[PDB]
């Protein structure tokens, strides 16, 4: 029932998911002059060399690439994190126009899209248990701006025609998510939530300062996806982002000066 339309979008979600008005909701605006450099934060460790992608799917709210998370093959460690977090999937949020689409903002700036690499804390054994814990998930958020093409994204873009409508999936093996990362791993971090229902407050957010650049043709292909299913009235999948939420009693920490 929930979505991004006028009658079921973010301003409605609290009725089914009252945690939408909770104390650690995401996304947030990152005020760069208020975030504090924390020298105790460790460098991020992104170990994706053994990643095993499985499928790509249109779930009616975004498209997602899934990974085999039954072993420590693609893990995130370090930074603000204690322990080992396994990569489960990645997906994007994007706009109808290049000036909007990201969920997090930086000094109120909206990027054209935002990539979420979703990882779960192995001490909880499975992702369903992890989402019930305040430190269960670590999502690596990466901004996209429009400029030069991102070669490591092209394989994703070229298969989207095969998952145009909700419920469609396709084989997506041998995809290397390292090709979606910027050069720098400098980041901001804060405790937050999933950005769609059920809005569970289980996420350590790690948002990279350096955006990746994608081409206008690449983001245009995101915008040709459909929220609807096959044989239904076509509604383009655009503006699948939640706006910034109240920071409340949180501090955003920076890994860099
Ligand atoms: C009619 C309509 C318009 C928009 C933007 C929608 C939906 C329907 S929707 O498909 O019900 N789900 C969604 O996310 N956005
Ligand atoms: C535990 C869990 C719950 C929900 C609603 C999820 C996922 C995991 S998920 O697999 O990360 N992808 C998704 O779209 N919804
Ligand atoms: C685990 C998970 C589940 C869902 C539905 C999510 C996310 C993570 S997410 O990365 O916060 N972004 C989003 O829109 N939905
Ligand atoms: Zn997301």
Instruction: Characterise 188 by phi-psi region: left (phi > 0), alpha (psi -120 to 50), beta (else).
Output: beta
Strands 85-94 and 212-214: unpaired
Which residues have their alpha-adjacent CB atom under 5 A from ion ligand 4? 116
* Beta strands 169-171 and 105-106, pairing class: unpaired
Number of domains making up the chain: 1
Taking CA 107 as the corner, what is the angle to CA 101 and CA 24, rounded to the nearest 5 degrees?
Answer: 75
Elucidated via: X-ray
Three-state secondary structure of the chain: CCCCCCCCCHHHHHHCCHHHHCCCCCCCEECCCCCEECCCCCCEEEECCCCCEEEEEECCCCEEEEECCCCCCCEEEECCCCCCEEEEEEEEEECCCCCCCCCCEECCECCCEEEEEEEEEHHHCCHHHHCCCCCCEEEEEEEEEECCCCHHHHHHHHHHHHHCCECCEEECCCCCHHHHCCCCCCEEEEEECCCCCCCCCCEEEEEECCCEEECHHHHHHHCCCECCECCCCCCECCCCCCCCCCCCCCCCEECCC
Owning domain of residue 51 = 1-257
Ligand nearest to the CA of 204: 3
Active-site hit among 1, 12, 14, 61 = 61
Residues enclosing ligand 1, CB less than 6 A?
3-5, 8, 227-228, 235
Resolution (A): 1.5
């Amino acid at each position: 029932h929930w979505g991004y339309g006028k009658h079921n979008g973010p301003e409605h979600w609290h009725k089914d998911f009252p945690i939408a008005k909770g104390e650690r909701q995401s996304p947030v605006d990152i005020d760069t002059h208020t975030a504090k450099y924390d020298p105790s934060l460790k460098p991020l460790s992104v170990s994706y060399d053994q990643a095993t992608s499985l499928r790509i799917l249109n779930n009616g709210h975004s498209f997602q690439v899934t990974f085999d998370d039954s072993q420590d093959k693609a893990v995130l460690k370090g930074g603000p994190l204690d322990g080992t977090y396994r990569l489960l999937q990645f997906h994007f949020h994007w706009g109808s126009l290049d000036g909007q689409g990201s969920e997090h903002t930086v000094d109120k700036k909206k990027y054209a899209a935002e990539l979420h690499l979703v990882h779960w804390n192995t001490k909880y054994g499975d992702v369903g248990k992890a989402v019930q814990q305040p430190d269960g998930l670590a999502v690596l958020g990466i901004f996209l701006k429009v400029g030069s093409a991102k070669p490591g994204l092209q394989k994703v873009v070229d298969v989207l025609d095969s998952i145009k409508t909700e419920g469609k999936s396709a084989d997506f093996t041998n995809f290397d998510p390292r090709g979606l990362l910027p050069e720098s791993l400098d980041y901001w971090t804060y405790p937050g939530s999933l950005t769609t229902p059920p809005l569970a407050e289980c996420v350590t957010w790690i948002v990279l300062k350096e955006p990746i650049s994608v081409s206008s043709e690449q983001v245009l292909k995101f915008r040709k996806l459909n929220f609807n299913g096959e044989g239904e009235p076509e509604e383009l999948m655009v503006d699948n982002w939640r706006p910034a939420q109240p920071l409340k009693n949180r501090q955003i920490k920076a890994s860099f000066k």
